[PDB]
């Protein structure tokens, strides 16, 4: 059961007696979308300061494990431990992250962390193609709007930061009205609330800055061509649904219909996905996957693919977009029936895995928007209630003759112009 109390800070807890671990954490409603192009990467630097050697050493001496996660809409700082020592994690979180920040922002520590983060971002930008392609897709989809800033930070901006930027961001965003205290695993809600009440655990006053511009989607493309690479990596997307939309689960199911494909695994060549019937003959791709990502203001629905067949890219894109076209007009009931159970198993593993850190992140990110956490059972009935008419109604609105965003790198010379791709979003025979 999920129990949430608004006394003090918003305290959420999900109790699981079977687990042998307990996680206690703080989730902030600010993310990479709350920063600007001149201090971009301040959140990643804060994360790596919390994860620095001295802080991690003092934590691990007591027997605790530290996790930090940076995203568009939230920042997560989690302390995981054994069930008997769940009170010690609160003490470490109070003493280190909240009460005092002078020790963590010393000159030498800041310089070392800055040099390590610069090295990491430099390695990412050159030797991680499928993920940086998705980052550029975000950066070109939401350009000149908060949601397009990369979460790690750019190489040029990360140099200009000083400790003053970090402390300014901490003053502006680490607030009581922006925070949720989350408890996961083998702990009780009453015990957690009592433990918080015994201490003060006050973060700050409130009134975080309000953004003047809301995120917007622009049809656009960016091409980063490099002929010294062996493949071509391509990510393509349209505007999707945000969190708290009525069509959220319909979006995830429509994504699940096409699924993912790996050419080298024997089993995934026999899937009921009809798209493979066009792909398999000439080995058009090595792998693809479909995504329905949702944020607070907007979302992305699309796919990502990698291939060595540098002379047949347009055929791959054409067949994929013709499979997308089929959703509006001629989706069949068996497709939806398979999609329901595939999605239920897909959602089942996500929310019911052994690791409590994923549960903590999900619960903290959920209560910061909805105000409450949807149960597993009520999720299934909405999934089971989906019909063919709903899928057709959603697809006729979100992907029929709509603008797209594209991002590719590698031997993308075979990738045709924008308009030729944009015309594939309709059939013209219907």
């Amino acid at each position: 059961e999920v129990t949430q109390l608004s006394n003090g800070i918003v305290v959420a807890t999900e109790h699981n007696p079977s687990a042998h671990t307990a996680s206690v954490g703080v989730v902030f409603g600010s993310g990479a979308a709350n920063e600007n192009p001149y201090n971009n990467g301040v959140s990643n630097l804060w994360k790596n300061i919390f994860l620095s050697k001295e802080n991690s050493a003092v934590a691990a001496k007591e027997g605790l494990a530290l996790s930090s996660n940076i995203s568009r809409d939230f920042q997560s700082y989690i302390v995981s431990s054994l069930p008997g020592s769940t009170d010690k994690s609160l003490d470490f979180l109070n003493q280190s992250f909240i009460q005092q920040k002078a020790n963590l922002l010393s000159s030498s520590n800041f310089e070392a962390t800055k040099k390590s983060v610069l090295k990491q971002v430099q390695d990412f930008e050159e030797n991680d193609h499928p993920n940086r392609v998705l980052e550029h897709l975000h950066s070109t989809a939401f350009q000149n709007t908060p949601l397009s800033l990369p979460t790690r930070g750019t190489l040029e901006s990360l140099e200009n930061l000083v400790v003053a930027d970090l402390e300014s961001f901490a003053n502006n965003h680490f607030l009581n009205s922006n925070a949720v205290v989350v408890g996961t695993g083998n702990i009780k809600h009453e015990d957690l609330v009592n433990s918080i009440e015994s201490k003060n655990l006050s973060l700050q006053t409130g009134t975080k800055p309000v953004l003047k511009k809301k995120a917007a989607f622009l049809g656009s493309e960016v091409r980063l061509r490099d002929d010294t690479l062996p493949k071509a990596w391509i990510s393509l997307a349209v505007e999707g649904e945000p969190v708290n939309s009525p069509n959220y689960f319909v979006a995830k199911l429509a994504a699940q219909i096409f699924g993912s494909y790996n050419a080298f695994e024997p089993a995934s060549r026999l899937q009921g996905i009809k798209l493979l019937d066009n792909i398999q003959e000439y080995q058009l791709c090595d792998n693809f996957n479909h995504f329905s990502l949702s944020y607070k203001d907007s979302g992305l629905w699309g796919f990502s693919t990698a291939t060595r067949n540098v002379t047949m890219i347009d055929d791959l894109i054409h067949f994929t977009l013709k499979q997308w076209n089929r959703l509006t007009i001629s989706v069949t009931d068996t497709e939806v029936e398979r999609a329901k159970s595939l999605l239920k198993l897909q959602l089942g593993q996500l929310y019911e895995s052994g690791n409590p850190v994923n549960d903590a992140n999900l619960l903290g990110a959920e209560v910061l928007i909805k105000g409450s956490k949807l149960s597993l059972g009520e999720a299934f009935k909405k999934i089971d209630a989906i019909t063919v008419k709903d899928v057709k109604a959603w697809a006729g609105k979100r992907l029929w003759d709509q603008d797209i965003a594209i991002a590719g790198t590698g031997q993308i010379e075979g990738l045709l112009d924008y308009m030729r791709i944009r015309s594939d979003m309709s059939m013209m025979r219907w």
Partner: peptide, 27 residues
Amino acid sequence: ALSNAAVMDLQSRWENMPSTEQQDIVS
């Protein structure tokens, strides 16, 4: 002084800038 990131190019950055964020710079 003041942090280099904030002051530099604080013209095109004046607009589309949070009101509470821009009231700290003048202090």
